[PDB]
Protein backbone atom coordinates (compact mmCIF):
# COMPACT_ATOMS: atom_id res chain seq x y z
CA UNK A 1 0.00 0.00 0.00
CA UNK A 2 1.37 3.39 -1.07
CA UNK A 3 1.15 6.06 1.62
CA UNK A 4 0.45 9.50 0.16
CA UNK A 5 1.09 12.58 2.29
CA UNK A 6 -1.14 15.66 2.17
CA UNK A 7 -0.16 18.91 3.81
CA UNK A 8 -2.85 20.89 5.55
CA UNK A 9 -3.90 22.74 2.44
CA UNK A 10 -6.83 22.20 0.21
CA UNK A 11 -4.51 21.95 -2.81
CA UNK A 12 -2.42 19.20 -1.18
CA UNK A 13 -5.55 17.13 -0.40
CA UNK A 14 -6.90 17.46 -3.94
CA UNK A 15 -3.60 16.37 -5.48
CA UNK A 16 -3.11 13.56 -2.91
CA UNK A 17 -6.54 12.13 -3.81
CA UNK A 18 -5.78 12.56 -7.50
CA UNK A 19 -2.54 10.55 -7.10
CA UNK A 20 -4.33 7.90 -5.03
CA UNK A 21 -7.08 7.44 -7.64
CA UNK A 22 -4.72 7.45 -10.61
CA UNK A 23 -2.53 4.79 -8.98
CA UNK A 24 -5.52 2.53 -8.34
CA UNK A 25 -6.90 3.12 -11.84
CA UNK A 26 -3.59 2.21 -13.52
CA UNK A 27 -2.16 -0.47 -11.23
CA UNK A 28 -2.95 -3.06 -8.52
CA UNK A 29 -1.30 -0.94 -5.81
CA UNK A 30 -3.48 -0.01 -2.86
CA UNK A 31 -3.16 3.52 -1.44
CA UNK A 32 -3.65 5.40 1.83
CA UNK A 33 -3.79 9.14 2.55
CA UNK A 34 -1.77 10.60 5.40
CA UNK A 35 -3.50 13.94 5.94
CA UNK A 36 -3.02 17.07 8.05
CA UNK A 37 0.79 17.17 7.76
CA UNK A 38 1.41 20.64 9.25
CA UNK A 39 4.26 21.89 7.03
CA UNK A 40 6.96 20.85 4.54
CA UNK A 41 9.13 19.98 7.56
CA UNK A 42 6.46 17.56 8.86
CA UNK A 43 6.13 16.12 5.32
CA UNK A 44 9.90 15.64 5.00
CA UNK A 45 10.27 14.06 8.46
CA UNK A 46 7.36 11.73 7.63
CA UNK A 47 9.19 10.66 4.45
CA UNK A 48 12.50 10.15 6.33
CA UNK A 49 10.57 8.01 8.84
CA UNK A 50 8.76 5.98 6.18
CA UNK A 51 5.37 7.27 7.40
CA UNK A 52 4.71 8.43 3.81
CA UNK A 53 5.91 7.08 0.44
CA UNK A 54 4.74 10.06 -1.63
CA UNK A 55 4.59 13.79 -0.94
CA UNK A 56 1.70 14.95 -3.12
CA UNK A 57 2.72 18.61 -3.09
CA UNK A 58 6.09 20.18 -2.43
CA UNK A 59 7.15 23.68 -3.45
CA UNK A 60 10.59 24.60 -4.78
CA UNK A 61 11.29 27.83 -2.82
CA UNK A 62 9.84 26.34 0.39
CA UNK A 63 12.19 23.34 0.69
CA UNK A 64 15.10 25.26 -0.87
CA UNK A 65 15.13 27.79 1.97
CA UNK A 66 14.20 25.44 4.85
CA UNK A 67 15.00 21.75 4.23
CA UNK A 68 18.14 22.54 2.19
CA UNK A 69 19.12 25.68 4.17
CA UNK A 70 20.06 27.53 0.94
CA UNK A 71 19.67 31.14 -0.24
CA UNK A 72 16.42 31.86 -1.94
CA UNK A 73 17.15 31.42 -5.64
CA UNK A 74 14.94 33.76 -7.69
CA UNK A 75 15.00 31.99 -11.07
CA UNK A 76 12.27 29.28 -11.45
CA UNK A 77 14.41 26.89 -13.53
CA UNK A 78 17.60 27.24 -11.45
CA UNK A 79 15.62 26.91 -8.21
CA UNK A 80 13.97 23.70 -9.44
CA UNK A 81 17.29 22.30 -10.70
CA UNK A 82 19.03 22.93 -7.32
CA UNK A 83 16.16 21.37 -5.39
CA UNK A 84 16.11 18.29 -7.70
CA UNK A 85 19.89 17.75 -7.61
CA UNK A 86 20.04 18.23 -3.82
CA UNK A 87 17.13 15.87 -3.11
CA UNK A 88 18.84 13.20 -5.20
CA UNK A 89 22.31 13.77 -3.65
CA UNK A 90 21.22 14.09 0.00
CA UNK A 91 18.31 11.64 0.21
CA UNK A 92 18.01 9.68 -3.09
CA UNK A 93 14.58 11.31 -3.27
CA UNK A 94 13.14 12.14 -6.68
CA UNK A 95 11.67 15.68 -6.79
CA UNK A 96 9.69 15.49 -10.05
CA UNK A 97 9.26 18.23 -12.65
CA UNK A 98 6.31 20.49 -11.86
CA UNK A 99 2.64 19.73 -12.21
CA UNK A 100 2.64 23.07 -14.08
CA UNK A 101 1.80 25.66 -11.40
CA UNK A 102 3.67 27.91 -8.97
CA UNK A 103 1.87 28.50 -5.67
CA UNK A 104 3.52 31.62 -4.34
CA UNK A 105 3.04 33.92 -1.40
CA UNK A 106 1.14 36.88 -2.83
CA UNK A 107 0.30 40.16 -1.08
CA UNK A 108 -3.41 40.54 -1.68
CA UNK A 109 -5.80 43.48 -1.12
CA UNK A 110 -9.35 44.44 -2.13
CA UNK A 111 -9.61 46.64 -5.23
CA UNK A 112 -11.36 49.26 -3.06
CA UNK A 113 -8.33 49.42 -0.71
CA UNK A 114 -5.90 49.58 -3.67
CA UNK A 115 -7.84 52.50 -5.20
CA UNK A 116 -8.12 54.38 -1.91
CA UNK A 117 -4.47 53.83 -0.95
CA UNK A 118 -3.03 53.93 -4.44
CA UNK A 119 -1.49 50.47 -4.37
CA UNK A 120 -0.13 48.48 -7.32
CA UNK A 121 3.09 47.05 -5.91
CA UNK A 122 4.35 45.73 -2.57
CA UNK A 123 6.57 48.85 -2.25
CA UNK A 124 3.46 51.04 -2.54
CA UNK A 125 2.41 49.74 0.88
CA UNK A 126 5.44 51.42 2.50
CA UNK A 127 3.97 54.98 2.75
CA UNK A 128 1.23 53.88 5.20
CA UNK A 129 2.56 50.47 6.35
CA UNK A 130 2.35 51.36 10.08
CA UNK A 131 -1.42 51.94 9.59
CA UNK A 132 -2.10 48.48 8.10
CA UNK A 133 -3.17 45.11 9.50
CA UNK A 134 -1.54 42.16 7.68
CA UNK A 135 -2.99 38.64 7.78
CA UNK A 136 -0.44 35.82 7.29
CA UNK A 137 -0.28 32.04 7.80
CA UNK A 138 0.85 30.39 11.05
CA UNK A 139 4.45 29.83 9.85
CA UNK A 140 5.58 32.77 7.69
CA UNK A 141 6.65 35.09 10.54
CA UNK A 142 9.29 32.61 11.70
CA UNK A 143 10.50 31.35 8.31
CA UNK A 144 14.11 31.93 7.28
CA UNK A 145 15.08 33.12 3.79
CA UNK A 146 11.55 33.70 2.42
CA UNK A 147 9.97 34.75 5.74
CA UNK A 148 8.99 38.06 7.39
CA UNK A 149 12.54 38.84 8.57
CA UNK A 150 13.76 38.59 4.97
CA UNK A 151 10.79 40.63 3.78
CA UNK A 152 11.66 43.47 6.20
CA UNK A 153 15.31 43.65 5.21
CA UNK A 154 14.46 43.62 1.48
CA UNK A 155 11.45 45.95 1.36
CA UNK A 156 12.76 48.08 4.25
CA UNK A 157 9.55 48.27 6.30
CA UNK A 158 7.27 46.47 8.77
CA UNK A 159 3.48 46.33 8.90
CA UNK A 160 1.79 48.03 11.87
CA UNK A 161 0.22 44.78 13.04
CA UNK A 162 0.65 41.25 11.63
CA UNK A 163 -1.92 38.52 12.36
CA UNK A 164 -0.94 34.86 11.98
CA UNK A 165 -3.91 32.58 11.23
CA UNK A 166 -4.87 29.43 9.36
CA UNK A 167 -4.20 30.21 5.67
CA UNK A 168 -7.75 29.21 4.73
CA UNK A 169 -9.06 32.21 6.73
CA UNK A 170 -7.14 35.05 5.02
CA UNK A 171 -9.42 35.33 1.98
CA UNK A 172 -12.53 36.22 3.97
CA UNK A 173 -10.50 38.34 6.42
CA UNK A 174 -9.31 40.60 3.57
CA UNK A 175 -12.62 40.55 1.65
CA UNK A 176 -14.49 41.64 4.80
CA UNK A 177 -12.11 44.51 5.69
CA UNK A 178 -10.82 42.77 8.83
CA UNK A 179 -7.29 42.86 7.37
CA UNK A 180 -5.93 45.60 5.07
CA UNK A 181 -3.71 43.06 3.30
CA UNK A 182 -3.03 39.35 3.50
CA UNK A 183 -0.16 37.14 2.42
CA UNK A 184 -2.26 34.73 0.39
CA UNK A 185 -1.30 31.68 -1.71
CA UNK A 186 -1.62 32.46 -5.44
CA UNK A 187 -3.43 29.22 -6.39
CA UNK A 188 -6.34 29.84 -4.02
CA UNK A 189 -9.55 30.12 -6.05
CA UNK A 190 -11.02 32.72 -3.69
CA UNK A 191 -8.61 35.37 -5.01
CA UNK A 192 -10.52 35.42 -8.35
CA UNK A 193 -13.89 34.56 -6.76
CA UNK A 194 -13.60 37.47 -4.32
CA UNK A 195 -12.30 39.86 -7.04
CA UNK A 196 -9.09 40.52 -5.05
CA UNK A 197 -5.92 42.18 -6.35
CA UNK A 198 -2.51 40.52 -6.19
CA UNK A 199 0.24 43.11 -5.65
CA UNK A 200 3.38 42.91 -7.80
CA UNK A 201 6.44 41.65 -5.87
CA UNK A 202 8.45 44.50 -7.39
CA UNK A 203 11.78 43.68 -5.68
CA UNK A 204 11.42 39.94 -6.43
CA UNK A 205 11.71 39.11 -2.74
CA UNK A 206 9.97 35.75 -3.00
CA UNK A 207 11.64 32.76 -4.61
CA UNK A 208 9.55 30.66 -6.99
CA UNK A 209 7.15 28.05 -5.60
CA UNK A 210 6.69 25.50 -8.42
CA UNK A 211 4.78 22.51 -7.21
CA UNK A 212 5.92 18.92 -7.65
CA UNK A 213 5.44 15.47 -6.12
CA UNK A 214 8.40 13.92 -4.25
CA UNK A 215 9.06 10.16 -4.03
CA UNK A 216 12.07 8.17 -2.74
CA UNK A 217 13.96 6.33 -5.51
CA UNK A 218 13.64 3.24 -3.28
CA UNK A 219 9.84 3.41 -3.59
CA UNK A 220 10.06 3.84 -7.39
CA UNK A 221 12.47 0.84 -7.57
CA UNK A 222 10.14 -1.38 -5.46
CA UNK A 223 7.17 -0.41 -7.65
CA UNK A 224 8.46 0.19 -11.24
CA UNK A 225 4.98 1.01 -12.61
CA UNK A 226 4.68 3.96 -10.18
CA UNK A 227 6.79 6.55 -12.09
CA UNK A 228 4.59 6.12 -15.20
CA UNK A 229 1.45 6.96 -13.25
CA UNK A 230 3.00 10.07 -11.67
CA UNK A 231 4.37 11.07 -15.10
CA UNK A 232 0.78 11.41 -16.36
CA UNK A 233 0.23 14.48 -14.13
CA UNK A 234 3.54 16.20 -14.82
CA UNK A 235 2.96 19.42 -16.78
CA UNK A 236 -0.80 18.84 -16.77
CA UNK A 237 -2.06 21.38 -14.22
CA UNK A 238 -1.53 25.10 -14.78
CA UNK A 239 -2.38 27.73 -12.14
CA UNK A 240 -5.81 28.63 -13.56
CA UNK A 241 -6.79 24.92 -13.42
CA UNK A 242 -5.39 24.58 -9.88
CA UNK A 243 -7.37 27.67 -8.80
CA UNK A 244 -10.56 26.18 -10.22
CA UNK A 245 -9.96 22.86 -8.45
CA UNK A 246 -9.15 24.62 -5.17
CA UNK A 247 -12.36 26.62 -5.44
CA UNK A 248 -14.43 23.45 -5.99
CA UNK A 249 -13.42 22.50 -2.41
CA UNK A 250 -13.14 25.91 -0.69
CA UNK A 251 -16.04 27.75 -2.35
CA UNK A 252 -18.43 24.93 -3.34
CA UNK A 253 -17.52 22.79 -0.28
CA UNK A 254 -16.97 19.57 -2.30
CA UNK A 255 -14.83 16.75 -0.94
CA UNK A 256 -11.27 16.75 -2.39
CA UNK A 257 -11.84 13.07 -3.37
CA UNK A 258 -14.87 14.11 -5.45
CA UNK A 259 -13.00 17.06 -7.03
CA UNK A 260 -10.04 14.79 -7.89
CA UNK A 261 -12.34 12.15 -9.39
CA UNK A 262 -14.17 14.67 -11.61
CA UNK A 263 -10.86 16.11 -12.86
CA UNK A 264 -9.52 12.64 -13.74
CA UNK A 265 -12.76 11.66 -15.56
CA UNK A 266 -12.72 14.82 -17.68
CA UNK A 267 -9.17 13.94 -18.82
CA UNK A 268 -9.99 10.22 -19.14
CA UNK A 269 -7.33 9.49 -16.49
CA UNK A 270 -4.77 10.74 -19.05
CA UNK A 271 -5.31 7.34 -20.78
Ligand X SMILES: CC1=N[C@H](C(=O)O)CCN1
Position of minimal CB gap to ligand X:
103
Nearer to ligand X, 31 or 104 (CB): 104
- Please identify, using beta-carbon distances, which residue of 21 and 43 lies nearer to ligand X: 43
Minimum CB–partner distance for residue 218 and ligand X (Å): 24
Picking from 192, 166, 199, the residue whose alpha carbon sits closest to that of residue 248 is: 192
Shortest Cβ distance from residue 59 to ligand X (Å)?
A: 4
Binding flag, residue 55, ligand X (CB under 6 A):
no
Q: How far is CA 77 from the centre of its chain?
A: 17
Q: What x/- string results for residues 77 through 106 when contact with ligand X is judged by CB under 6 A?
A: --------------------------xxx-
- Nearest distance in Å: CB 17, ligand X: 17
Query: What DSSP letter does each residue of the chain carry, written as one string?
Result: -EEEEEESSHHHHHHHHHHHHHHHHHSS--EEEEEEE-SHHHHHHHHHHTS-SEEEEEEHHHHHHTTT-------HHHHHHHHHHHHHHHH-EEEPPP-S-B--EEEEE-HHHHHHHT-SBTGGGGGGGGG-EEEE-SSGGG-SSSSHHHHHHHH----SEEEE--GGGHHHHHHTTS-SEEEEETT-THHHHTT-EEPB-TT--SPP-BEEEEEEHHHHHHSTTHHHHHHTTTT---HHHHHHHHHHHHTT---HHHHHHHHHHHTGGG-
Q: Which is nearer to ligand X, 102 or 124 (CB)?
A: 102
In the complex, least distance from residue 164 CB atom to ligand X, rounded to whole angstroms: 13
Q: Which of residues 60-79 bind ligand X (CB under 6 A)?
A: 62
Instruction: Report 195-254 residues binding ligand X (CB under 6 A).
Output: 209
As measured in angstroms, the least distance from the Cβ of 66 to ligand X is: 8
Q: Is the dihedral of CA 146, 149, 152, 153 positive or negative?
A: negative
For the bound state, the minimum distance from the C-beta of residue 39 to ligand X, rounded and expressed in Å, comes to 6
Between 7 and 229, CB nearer to ligand X = 7
CB of 80 to ligand X, least distance (A): 15
Output 167 or 226, the one with its CB closest to ligand X: 167
Q: How many CB atoms lie within 10 A of CB 69?
A: 9
Pick out residues in 134-193 that bind ligand X (CB under 6 A). 185
Q: Based on CB atoms, which residue is closest to ligand X, 39 or 236?
A: 39
Site of interaction with ligand X (CB under 6 A): 39-40, 59, 62, 103-105, 185, 209
Amino acid sequence: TIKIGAQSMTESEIVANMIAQLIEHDTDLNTALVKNLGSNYVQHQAMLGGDIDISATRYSGTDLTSTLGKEAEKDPKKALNIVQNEFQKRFSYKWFDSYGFDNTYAFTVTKKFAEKEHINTVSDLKKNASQYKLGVDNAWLKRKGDGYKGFVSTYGFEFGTTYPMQIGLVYDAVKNGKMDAVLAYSTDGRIKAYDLKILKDDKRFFPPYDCSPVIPEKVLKEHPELEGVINKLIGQIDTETMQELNYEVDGKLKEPSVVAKEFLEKHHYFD
